[PDB]
């Protein structure tokens, strides 16, 4: 099928600014609108990254779109956990260099409990001493972690790409052994990936609610998000989504 991990390290999108206006009142609507603007810019980076991801081009265009649309929240949350870990040792939520959430911002954004759920993932990065190599492979696995209930147009091609990145993750964990054993670390990483589905389910519930009442709440959505959410919301709410778990329940 195929160093794919060294390609991943080099194609990682550069950090972008939120364009946060600290002179404007820190209302839930202003903070959420800033976060949405930032997500729109990061989704453009995600698409550019996916385009040069080894093996992604082999999948048909319709499947590439499906995968990006189902996984967008997972990818954004996982990268936020990484930035939080790398730049603050997971003390804060590092959305961007100009937008770092402390307890005050978590309360002001009206998303305190969701932010705490996210902060718990970045704390697991500290516990595990997650490496950049592990992180990049895991992020590809998240892009490939949600499919339609009736599967993709090219299901076999998708499964081949997914299997090969799981093999890459298993090869990578050998570099961080305890005794010299690495099976333990592999299952700690797959448990971590599986736990992203429940956190993302809660983030999407909040997102969809704000999307359905955006003008009433004074929350703005960039075009990229309008397009993604408009397609994803009826698919997710009708149960057409299928999260792929390494370890059931």
């Amino acid at each position: 099928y195929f160093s794919p991990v060294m390609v991943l390290e080099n194609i990682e999108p550069e950090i972008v600014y939120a364009g946060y206006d600290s002179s404007k009142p820190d209302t839930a609507e202003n903070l959420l609108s800033t976060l949405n603007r930032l997500a729109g810019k990061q989704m453009i980076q995600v698409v550019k990254w996916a385009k040069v991801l080894p093996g992604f081009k082999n999948l048909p265009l319709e499947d590439q779109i499906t995968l990006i649309q189902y996984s967008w929240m997972s990818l954004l949350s996982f990268a936020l956990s990484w930035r939080s870990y790398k730049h603050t040792n997971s003390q804060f939520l590092y959305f961007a260099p100009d937008l770092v959430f402390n307890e005050e911002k978590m309360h002001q954004s009206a998303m305190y409990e969701l932010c705490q759920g996210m902060h718990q993932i970045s704390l697991q990065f500290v516990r595990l001493q997650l490496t950049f190599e592990e992180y990049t492979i895991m992020k590809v696995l998240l892009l490939l972690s949600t499919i339609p209930k009736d599967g993709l147009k090219s299901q076999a091609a998708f499964e081949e790409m997914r299997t090969n990145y799981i093999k890459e993750l298993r090869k990578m964990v050998t570099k961080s052994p305890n005794s010299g054993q690495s099976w333990q670390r592999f299952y700690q990483l797959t448990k971590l990936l599986d736990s992203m589905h429940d956190l993302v389910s809660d983030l999407l519930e909040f997102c969809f609610y704000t999307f359905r009442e955006s003008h009433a709440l004074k929350v703005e959505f960039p075009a990229m998000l309008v397009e993604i959410i408009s397609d994803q919301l009826p698919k997710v709410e009708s149960g057409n989504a299928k999260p792929l778990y390494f370890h059931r329940k």
């Binding site: 453009i44 698409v47 385009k51 779109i65 397009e227």
Partner: peptide
């Protein structure tokens, strides 16, 4: 073409 289609095909 949607924004995603344009970005993926350009």
């Amino acid at each position: 073409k949607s924004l995603l289609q344009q970005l993926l095909t350009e």
